[model samples]
Target: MGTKREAILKVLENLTPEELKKFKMKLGTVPLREGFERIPRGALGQLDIVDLTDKLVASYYEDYAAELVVAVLRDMRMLEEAARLQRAA
Candidate 1:
Protein backbone atom coordinates (compact mmCIF):
# COMPACT_ATOMS: atom_id res chain seq x y z
CA MET A 1 0.00 0.00 0.00
CA GLY A 2 0.99 3.67 -0.39
CA THR A 3 2.90 5.23 2.52
CA LYS A 4 0.44 8.07 3.18
CA ARG A 5 -2.57 5.77 3.08
CA GLU A 6 -0.90 3.32 5.45
CA ALA A 7 0.14 6.11 7.81
CA ILE A 8 -3.37 7.58 7.97
CA LEU A 9 -4.98 4.24 8.77
CA LYS A 10 -2.31 3.49 11.37
CA VAL A 11 -2.99 6.83 13.08
CA LEU A 12 -6.73 6.10 13.06
CA GLU A 13 -6.04 2.90 15.00
CA ASN A 14 -4.73 4.95 17.92
CA LEU A 15 -7.76 7.22 18.33
CA THR A 16 -10.28 6.91 21.15
CA PRO A 17 -13.93 7.09 20.15
CA GLU A 18 -14.16 10.53 21.73
CA GLU A 19 -11.17 11.78 19.79
CA LEU A 20 -12.58 10.42 16.54
CA LYS A 21 -15.88 12.15 17.24
CA LYS A 22 -14.29 15.58 17.54
CA PHE A 23 -11.96 15.04 14.63
CA LYS A 24 -14.87 13.96 12.44
CA MET A 25 -16.74 17.15 13.32
CA LYS A 26 -13.67 19.29 12.65
CA LEU A 27 -13.46 17.75 9.21
CA GLY A 28 -17.19 18.43 8.56
CA THR A 29 -17.79 14.72 8.13
CA VAL A 30 -19.72 13.96 11.33
CA PRO A 31 -23.29 14.52 12.44
CA LEU A 32 -23.67 17.62 14.61
CA ARG A 33 -26.62 16.15 16.50
CA GLU A 34 -25.51 13.83 19.28
CA GLY A 35 -29.08 13.24 20.43
CA PHE A 36 -29.76 11.12 17.35
CA GLU A 37 -27.85 8.24 18.89
CA ARG A 38 -30.56 8.22 21.59
CA ILE A 39 -33.40 8.15 19.07
CA PRO A 40 -36.48 6.67 20.73
CA ARG A 41 -38.85 3.99 19.52
CA GLY A 42 -41.49 4.95 16.94
CA ALA A 43 -39.61 8.13 16.13
CA LEU A 44 -40.16 8.77 12.37
CA GLY A 45 -41.54 5.28 11.95
CA GLN A 46 -44.27 6.55 9.65
CA LEU A 47 -41.89 7.67 6.94
CA ASP A 48 -41.80 5.16 4.12
CA ILE A 49 -38.43 4.50 2.55
CA VAL A 50 -40.07 3.58 -0.76
CA ASP A 51 -41.73 6.99 -1.00
CA LEU A 52 -38.51 8.74 -0.15
CA THR A 53 -36.57 6.91 -2.83
CA ASP A 54 -39.31 7.67 -5.35
CA LYS A 55 -39.21 11.31 -4.41
CA LEU A 56 -35.47 11.36 -4.86
CA VAL A 57 -35.86 9.90 -8.33
CA ALA A 58 -38.58 12.36 -9.22
CA SER A 59 -36.42 15.27 -8.18
CA TYR A 60 -33.50 13.98 -10.18
CA TYR A 61 -35.61 13.26 -13.25
CA GLU A 62 -37.06 16.75 -13.25
CA ASP A 63 -35.50 19.67 -15.11
CA TYR A 64 -32.08 18.15 -15.77
CA ALA A 65 -30.51 18.67 -12.33
CA ALA A 66 -29.64 15.07 -11.51
CA GLU A 67 -26.29 16.08 -10.14
CA LEU A 68 -27.91 18.33 -7.56
CA VAL A 69 -30.29 15.58 -6.54
CA VAL A 70 -27.36 13.21 -6.10
CA ALA A 71 -25.63 15.74 -3.88
CA VAL A 72 -28.66 16.00 -1.62
CA LEU A 73 -28.96 12.21 -1.52
CA ARG A 74 -25.29 12.02 -0.62
CA ASP A 75 -25.93 14.22 2.38
CA MET A 76 -28.77 12.00 3.52
CA ARG A 77 -26.63 8.87 3.14
CA MET A 78 -23.78 10.48 5.09
CA LEU A 79 -26.02 11.34 8.03
CA GLU A 80 -27.61 7.90 7.93
CA GLU A 81 -24.21 6.25 8.02
CA ALA A 82 -23.13 8.48 10.89
CA ALA A 83 -26.24 7.63 12.87
CA ARG A 84 -25.76 3.92 12.26
CA LEU A 85 -22.10 4.02 13.25
CA GLN A 86 -22.93 5.84 16.49
CA ARG A 87 -25.66 3.34 17.28
CA ALA A 88 -23.28 0.50 16.50
CA ALA A 89 -20.92 1.84 19.13
Candidate 2:
Protein backbone atom coordinates (compact mmCIF):
# COMPACT_ATOMS: atom_id res chain seq x y z
CA MET A 1 0.00 0.00 0.00
CA GLY A 2 0.99 3.57 -0.55
CA THR A 3 1.71 5.81 2.43
CA LYS A 4 -1.74 7.42 2.27
CA ARG A 5 0.22 10.42 1.09
CA GLU A 6 -1.39 10.11 -2.30
CA ALA A 7 -4.78 9.64 -0.72
CA ILE A 8 -4.37 12.76 1.41
CA LEU A 9 -3.24 14.79 -1.59
CA LYS A 10 -6.12 13.49 -3.65
CA VAL A 11 -8.60 14.59 -1.03
CA LEU A 12 -7.22 18.11 -0.87
CA GLU A 13 -6.93 18.36 -4.65
CA ASN A 14 -10.54 17.26 -4.95
CA LEU A 15 -11.64 20.36 -3.09
CA THR A 16 -12.75 23.48 -4.92
CA PRO A 17 -10.83 26.68 -4.39
CA GLU A 18 -13.32 27.99 -1.86
CA GLU A 19 -13.33 24.71 -0.01
CA LEU A 20 -9.56 24.59 0.00
CA LYS A 21 -9.51 28.06 1.49
CA LYS A 22 -11.93 26.98 4.16
CA PHE A 23 -9.78 23.96 4.86
CA LYS A 24 -6.78 26.17 5.47
CA MET A 25 -8.89 28.51 7.55
CA LYS A 26 -10.15 25.68 9.68
CA LEU A 27 -6.68 24.26 10.01
CA GLY A 28 -5.38 27.50 11.38
CA THR A 29 -8.33 28.05 13.67
CA VAL A 30 -8.90 24.61 15.14
CA PRO A 31 -7.09 23.39 18.23
CA LEU A 32 -4.68 20.70 17.27
CA ARG A 33 -4.03 17.67 19.46
CA GLU A 34 -0.67 16.76 20.96
CA GLY A 35 0.57 14.89 17.94
CA PHE A 36 0.35 17.98 15.79
CA GLU A 37 2.12 20.33 18.18
CA ARG A 38 5.00 20.75 15.74
CA ILE A 39 2.90 22.68 13.22
CA PRO A 40 3.03 26.39 13.75
CA ARG A 41 0.11 28.75 13.15
CA GLY A 42 1.93 31.04 10.70
CA ALA A 43 3.06 28.04 8.72
CA LEU A 44 -0.43 26.58 8.76
CA GLY A 45 -1.75 29.74 7.13
CA GLN A 46 0.94 29.56 4.49
CA LEU A 47 0.48 25.88 3.73
CA ASP A 48 -0.85 24.97 0.31
CA ILE A 49 -2.23 21.51 -0.29
CA VAL A 50 1.21 20.16 -1.19
CA ASP A 51 2.80 21.62 1.90
CA LEU A 52 0.02 20.28 4.03
CA THR A 53 0.42 16.83 2.54
CA ASP A 54 4.13 16.89 3.21
CA LYS A 55 3.69 17.91 6.81
CA LEU A 56 1.01 15.35 7.41
CA VAL A 57 2.81 12.52 5.65
CA ALA A 58 6.01 13.36 7.44
CA SER A 59 4.38 13.51 10.86
CA TYR A 60 1.47 11.13 10.82
CA TYR A 61 2.28 8.79 7.98
CA GLU A 62 -1.21 7.28 7.47
CA ASP A 63 -3.28 7.30 10.65
CA TYR A 64 -2.80 10.75 12.09
CA ALA A 65 -2.96 12.35 8.67
CA ALA A 66 -6.41 10.89 8.20
CA GLU A 67 -7.33 11.62 11.79
CA LEU A 68 -6.25 15.23 11.75
CA VAL A 69 -7.73 15.86 8.33
CA VAL A 70 -11.03 14.44 9.50
CA ALA A 71 -10.89 16.71 12.55
CA VAL A 72 -10.19 19.79 10.46
CA LEU A 73 -12.84 19.02 7.86
CA ARG A 74 -15.42 18.32 10.53
CA ASP A 75 -14.50 21.51 12.32
CA MET A 76 -15.03 23.32 9.03
CA ARG A 77 -18.53 21.79 8.96
CA MET A 78 -17.69 19.79 5.87
CA LEU A 79 -19.19 16.51 6.97
CA GLU A 80 -19.31 14.65 3.66
CA GLU A 81 -15.63 15.00 2.94
CA ALA A 82 -14.69 14.31 6.56
CA ALA A 83 -16.64 11.08 6.65
CA ARG A 84 -15.32 10.03 3.26
CA LEU A 85 -11.78 10.56 4.50
CA GLN A 86 -12.45 8.73 7.76
CA ARG A 87 -13.64 5.75 5.77
CA ALA A 88 -10.64 5.93 3.53
CA ALA A 89 -8.44 5.60 6.60
Candidate 3:
Protein backbone atom coordinates (compact mmCIF):
# COMPACT_ATOMS: atom_id res chain seq x y z
CA MET A 1 0.00 0.00 0.00
CA GLY A 2 2.97 2.25 0.49
CA THR A 3 6.57 2.50 -0.64
CA LYS A 4 8.88 -0.20 0.71
CA ARG A 5 10.52 2.38 2.93
CA GLU A 6 7.19 3.24 4.51
CA ALA A 7 6.21 -0.40 4.71
CA ILE A 8 9.48 -1.24 6.40
CA LEU A 9 9.07 1.66 8.80
CA LYS A 10 5.64 0.42 9.78
CA VAL A 11 7.06 -3.01 10.47
CA LEU A 12 9.81 -1.53 12.59
CA GLU A 13 7.25 0.59 14.39
CA ASN A 14 5.19 -2.48 15.10
CA LEU A 15 8.02 -4.28 16.81
CA THR A 16 7.87 -4.72 20.56
CA PRO A 17 10.48 -3.02 22.73
CA GLU A 18 12.16 -6.37 23.33
CA GLU A 19 12.06 -7.22 19.68
CA LEU A 20 13.56 -3.87 18.76
CA LYS A 21 16.34 -4.45 21.26
CA LYS A 22 17.12 -7.83 19.72
CA PHE A 23 16.83 -6.41 16.20
CA LYS A 24 19.38 -3.76 17.07
CA MET A 25 21.73 -6.40 18.47
CA LYS A 26 21.31 -8.48 15.31
CA LEU A 27 21.78 -5.35 13.24
CA GLY A 28 25.20 -4.90 14.82
CA THR A 29 26.25 -8.21 13.29
CA VAL A 30 25.09 -7.35 9.76
CA PRO A 31 27.73 -5.67 7.67
CA LEU A 32 26.60 -2.21 6.68
CA ARG A 33 29.10 -0.87 4.19
CA GLU A 34 29.53 2.65 3.02
CA GLY A 35 31.56 2.68 -0.18
CA PHE A 36 34.33 0.16 0.58
CA GLU A 37 34.27 0.80 4.32
CA ARG A 38 32.14 -0.86 6.97
CA ILE A 39 30.27 1.41 9.36
CA PRO A 40 31.55 1.32 12.93
CA ARG A 41 29.55 0.22 15.99
CA GLY A 42 29.52 3.78 17.26
CA ALA A 43 27.84 5.00 14.09
CA LEU A 44 25.14 2.34 14.26
CA GLY A 45 24.58 3.03 17.96
CA GLN A 46 24.14 6.72 17.31
CA LEU A 47 21.10 6.25 15.13
CA ASP A 48 17.76 5.14 16.47
CA ILE A 49 15.35 3.16 14.31
CA VAL A 50 14.02 6.14 12.36
CA ASP A 51 17.46 7.36 11.44
CA LEU A 52 18.61 3.85 10.68
CA THR A 53 15.56 3.31 8.46
CA ASP A 54 16.24 6.50 6.53
CA LYS A 55 19.91 5.69 6.20
CA LEU A 56 19.21 2.24 4.89
CA VAL A 57 16.60 3.48 2.45
CA ALA A 58 18.92 6.19 1.22
CA SER A 59 21.96 3.94 0.89
CA TYR A 60 20.26 0.95 -0.69
CA TYR A 61 17.64 0.47 -3.37
CA GLU A 62 14.03 0.25 -2.23
CA ASP A 63 14.11 -3.48 -3.08
CA TYR A 64 17.23 -4.12 -1.02
CA ALA A 65 15.90 -1.86 1.72
CA ALA A 66 12.96 -4.18 2.19
CA GLU A 67 15.18 -7.22 1.98
CA LEU A 68 17.53 -5.88 4.63
CA VAL A 69 14.64 -5.19 6.97
CA VAL A 70 13.37 -8.71 6.41
CA ALA A 71 16.80 -10.13 7.04
CA VAL A 72 17.12 -8.31 10.35
CA LEU A 73 13.65 -9.42 11.40
CA ARG A 74 14.57 -13.00 10.53
CA ASP A 75 17.72 -12.70 12.60
CA MET A 76 15.61 -11.42 15.48
CA ARG A 77 13.49 -14.59 15.09
CA MET A 78 10.47 -12.67 13.91
CA LEU A 79 9.80 -15.13 11.13
CA GLU A 80 6.18 -14.10 10.60
CA GLU A 81 7.19 -10.46 10.33
CA ALA A 82 9.85 -11.27 7.74
CA ALA A 83 7.36 -13.33 5.79
CA ARG A 84 4.91 -10.46 5.96
CA LEU A 85 7.42 -8.09 4.40
CA GLN A 86 8.31 -10.63 1.72
CA ARG A 87 4.62 -11.22 1.03
CA ALA A 88 4.00 -7.50 0.79
CA ALA A 89 6.38 -7.26 -2.11
TM-score of 3: 0.73
lDDT of each: 0.32, 0.72, 0.72
Considering every candidate listed, which one attains the maximal lDDT?
A: 3
Candidate 1 TM-score, true structure as reference: 0.30
lDDT of 3 by residue, 26-78 (tens): 66567765652333466566766787777666666678768777888988778
Instruction: Give the local distance difference test score of model 2.
Output: 0.72
Instruction: Write the residue-wise lDDT of candidate 2 on 1-89 in tens digits.
Output: 55466667778898788878777666556566764554566666677889877766666667876887778777767788778777674
Better of 1 and 3 by lDDT: 3
Greater TM-score among 1 and 2 belongs to 2
In candidate 2, position 79 carries an lDDT of 84
Pairs of residues at least 3 apart in sequence or in different chains that clash in candidate 1 = none
> What lDDT is obtained when candidate 1 is compared to the true structure?
0.32
Best-fitting candidate, measured by TM-score? 3
Global Cα lDDT for candidate 3: 0.72
